[PDB]
Amino acid sequence: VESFDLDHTKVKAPYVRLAGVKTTPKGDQISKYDLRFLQPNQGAIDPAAIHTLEHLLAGYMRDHLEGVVDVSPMGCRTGMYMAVIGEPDEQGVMKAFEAALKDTAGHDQPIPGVSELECGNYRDHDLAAARQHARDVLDQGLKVQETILL
């Protein structure tokens, strides 16, 4: 399936979960992952904080994982979505996400790409909140979440 029918009341955040896999015409695979920060419907990450997380993780995830096609916030704002070129590898993605979260928690330099030239809403950021969201996930501890279908 390209997108499994997930029961959001059954998962246990924070986690890494293979959200789907698409086969390309030549036989390669694109794997999609649900990088869940918060428990579905128990709160959301503020828009400025998730915007900063996107800027930081776009770089940090790529520092720890090859084949990343996109790292983007989810509309529900409880986590990030990522598409990767490669066979499903939840364990490898979890370790990469963990390393990237440590980079994020300790990011005390200016936020990369924040300017009128490089960002579509450079006034809407929050490094302190992004760093703390990363710290909270690490404190809670990641796990590979199984997909529970509705």
Show the binding pattern over residues 94-133: x = contacts Zn ion (CB under 5 A), - = does not: -------------------------x--------------
108 belongs to the binding site for its own copies (CB under 8 A): no
Residues 13-52 contacting ligand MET, CB under 6 A: none
Q: How far is CA 22 from CA 1, 6, 70, 71, in A?
A: 7, 17, 15, 17
70 belongs to the binding site for its own copies (CB under 8 A): yes
Place of tokens 């302190």: 128
Q: Is 135 helix (H, G, I), strand (E, B) or coil?
A: helix
Residues 24-83 contacting Zn ion, CB under 5 A: 76
- The number of beta carbons lying within 10 Å of the beta carbon of residue 103 is 16
Is residue 64 within 8 A of residue 56, CB to CB? The reply is no
129 binds, among Zn ion, its own copies, ligand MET, none (CB under 5 to 8 A by kind): none
- Compute the C-alpha angle 67/73/74, nearest 5°: 110
Best CA proximity match to 144, nearest among 72, 100, 96: 96
Show the binding pattern over residues 80-119: x = contacts ligand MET (CB under 6 A), - = does not: -x--------------------------------------
Instruction: Name the site residues for its own copies (rule: CB under 8 A).
Output: 1, 3-9, 22, 24-30, 32, 40-41, 44, 47, 50-55, 58-59, 62-63, 67, 69-70, 72-79, 81, 83, 85, 112-113, 116-124, 150
